[PDB]
Design a protein around this ligand. Structure first.
Ligand code: NA
Ligand code: NA
Length: 358
């Protein structure tokens, strides 16, 4: 009966992830968690692939806001500060989630209540590649001080009927941080890529530098972060541009809105679920046609070519090939919080709708 996972009552009322906000589903009850892209490096084998974090200045500053407290908490309570900081980054989307800022202050996505205080949120889950959402109560803290403390208490004390559920993440039980992240794989979240995501965060943000006895100087922290080789990629790397949130974080709709902004073009926040984008955009004075076009939003009608039967799908056109096929980028089709890409053949591409942003 692990409280961090979906309960029987939560699963009966499960929903498909919302792609748009309305009067019922809003920003105050929708989480934000870190997004990841597939590592462009050719892996040694079919199972050794990694994920790349979406690099960000918010993440760097979020690390500095808690690296000191995570370091001290780590040494005292036998916890990898790196794992703790990575989980904070992942679960709160580098501090940007409504669950992580005032007045909730829950940085680790811990469910339940704290000192009798709680806050309901829609939270994304996965059964392999089958994505769903559940509405659950999350611990509401007076500040981030009690959140960091409560995380350490969870790892050390565990749960009812399994007090040592997180004992294998303890520094004395796990030879390295990778042993610890692999045990969080099925005890903390349903996301089947949880460990690989944490490892990606730890590596890129050099979080092991906070695992040792003496903590380093935070003024030289940004100097240690090494960039990914992005010089031989075909397209501009993804980056979260805006602060505003017109669509639920990470969904296909949100991804296209943000990706379009990187190229200085916008699309409104009132287009609703993906399949309604083409007809609504057309009404709202956007150029919309069946001709494939570079950097346009590409819409799939409900149920079209495997797209979601109710919501359809929306993606961003990275390239229009000379043979008429298109290269698109999108989110949450390959897995939870995963940005992926593919090629749509010419005959299929000519049947989709392309929205030129303003
Ligand atoms: Na439509
Ligand atoms: Na499809």
């Amino acid at each position: 009966k692990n409280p961090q996972l979906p309960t029987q009552d939560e699963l009966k009322h499960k929903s498909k992830p919302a792609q748009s906000f309305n009067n019922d589903v809003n920003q105050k009850d929708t989480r934000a968690t870190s997004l990841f892209e597939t590592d462009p490096s050719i892996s040694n084998n079919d199972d050794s692939g990694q994920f790349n974090v979406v690099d960000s200045k918010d993440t760097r500053q979020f690390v500095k806001s808690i690296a000191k407290d995570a370091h001290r908490i780590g040494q005292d309570n036998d916890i990898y500060a790196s794992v703790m900081i990575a989980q904070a980054i992942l679960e709160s989307d580098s501090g940007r989630s409504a669950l992580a800022k005032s007045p909730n202050h829950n940085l680790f996505g811990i469910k339940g209540a704290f000192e009798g205080n709680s806050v309901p949120f829609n939270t994304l889950e996965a059964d392999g590649n089958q994505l769903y959402s559940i509405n659950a109560g999350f611990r509401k803290y007076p500040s981030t001080k009690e959140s960091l403390k409560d995380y350490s208490d969870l790892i050390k004390n565990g749960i009812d009927g399994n007090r040592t559920i997180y004992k294998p993440t303890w520094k004395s039980e796990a030879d390295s941080y990778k042993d610890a992240t692999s045990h969080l794989s099925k005890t903390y979240a349903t996301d089947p890529n949880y460990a690989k995501k944490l490892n990606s965060i730890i590596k890129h943000y050099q979080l092991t530098q906070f695992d040792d006895e003496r903590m380093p100087d935070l003024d030289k922290y940004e100097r240690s972060i090494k960039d990914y080789d992005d010089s031989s990629d075909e397209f501009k790397p993804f980056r979260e541009v805006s602060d505003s949130m017109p669509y639920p974080h990470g969904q296909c709709t949100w991804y296209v809105y943000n990706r379009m902004k990187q190229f200085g073009t916008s699309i409104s926040g009132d287009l609703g679920d993906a399949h309604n984008w083409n007809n609504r955009a057309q009404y709202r004075d956007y150029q919309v046609s069946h001709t494939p076009k570079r950097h346009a939003a590409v819409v799939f009608e409900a149920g079209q070519f495997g797209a979601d039967q109710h919501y359809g799908h929306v993606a961003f056109v990275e390239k229009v090939n000379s043979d008429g096929s298109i290269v698109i980028s999108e989110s949450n089709v390959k897995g939870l919080g995963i940005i992926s890409h593919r090629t749509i053949n010419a005959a299929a591409a000519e049947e989709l709708s392309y929205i030129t942003g303003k």
